[PDB]
Design a protein around this ligand. Structure first.
Ligand SMILES: Nc1ncnc2c1ncn2[C@@H]1O[C@H](COP(=O)(O)OP(=O)(O)OP(=O)(O)OP(=O)(O)OC[C@H]2O[C@@H](n3cnc4c(N)ncnc43)[C@H](O)[C@@H]2O)[C@@H](O)[C@H]1O
Ligand SMILES: [Mn+2]
Ligand SMILES: [Mn+2]
Length: 269
């Protein structure tokens, strides 16, 4: 069976409990994780240890908190007490875990299921070929010896409009923002990097990225996490918002792909 779980955010206990609920069995089953494995929850170290141990039985995409963790590890960015990353950063296996984490994709595609996954979703300004090239380009920098320069370069809110002519720092920044920070779009597909609220509270003319017709969403289902104020609701057919805010006292949500059956694990917080 195929299971897809939203943002874990260090909620190791809830993750294991939900997987036991569906009797997740590596070798017979595969797990898709929407990223944001770490931060805020208390168990980031245990979560990374377990997901890494799953090997080919897990298909991960990196989220913005995974990238932030990597920026803190590399000395690029300051550690915020509230993220609760210190046990992981001080672990004897921190090197093994984070060097594994930076090698994971930003984008997962299963052609037989016609299923795409990314942390924040797919901007309507990308077709599939472009999304794949963009993921490849950022994954190559993240997996290189020089990844701390990219992590330093990634911070920023501009440019917020895609063009095949983007070059250099702006190109990587847009790609990173599109995969891991996107929520709202302007009618032209342009990214808005400030509004984090539910779509009801969003100011006009902002609309969820999934409310704008785009070539990937027209051919593929898209699963994503990240947007917790969505509470997993209000999406159109074929759009699966999996982040139900477990670290926030919400719930950890698991979707079984074969029968579209949902399983939910309450926050223990
Ligand atoms: O910068 P980004 O990269 O866009 O991401 P982020 O909002 O800072 O954090 P995150 O990726 O964890 O997303 P989340 O919605 O959980 O968190 C973003 C913000 O959403 C808020 N939030 C969580 N649930 C919400 C809800 N139900 N309604 C409104 N806001 C909510 C949280 O306070 C959090 O500060
Ligand atoms: Mn996120
Ligand atoms: Mn998140």
């Amino acid at each position: 069976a195929t299971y897809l779980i939203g943002d874990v955010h260090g909620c190791y206990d809830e993750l294991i409990a939900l997987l036991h609920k569906v009797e997740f069995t590596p070798g017979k089953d595969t797990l898709w994780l929407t990223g944001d494995l770490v931060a805020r929850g208390p168990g980031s170290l245990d979560v990374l240890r377990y997901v890494k141990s799953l090997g080919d039985s897990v298909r991960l995409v990196l989220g913005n908190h995974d990238l932030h963790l990597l920026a803190v590890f590399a000395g690029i960015s300051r550690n915020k007490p509230k993220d609760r990353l210190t046990p992981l950063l001080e672990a004897p296996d921190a090197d093994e875990l984070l060097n594994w984490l930076r090698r994971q994709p930003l984008l997962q595609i299963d052609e037989e299921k016609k299923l795409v996954m990314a942390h924040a979703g797919i901007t309507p300004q990308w077709d599939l070929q472009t999304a794949k090239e963009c993921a490849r380009d950022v994954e190559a920098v993240l997996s290189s010896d020089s990844y701390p320069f990219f992590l330093d370069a990634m911070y920023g809110d501009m440019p917020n409009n895609w063009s095949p002519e983007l070059r250099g720092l702006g190109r990587l920044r847009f790609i990173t923002n599109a995969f891991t920070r996107m929520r709202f779009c302007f009618p032209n597909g342009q990214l808005d990097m400030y509004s984090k609220e539910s779509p009801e509270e969003a100011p006009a003319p902002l609309k969820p990225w999934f409310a704008i017709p785009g070539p990937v969403a027209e051919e593929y289902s898209i699963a994503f996490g990240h947007w917790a104020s969505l509470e997993g609701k209000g999406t159109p057919e074929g759009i699966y918002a999996l982040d139900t805010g477990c670290c926030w006292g919400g719930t950890l949500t698991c979707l079984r792909w074969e029968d579209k059956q949902y399983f939910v694990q309450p926050s223990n917080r």
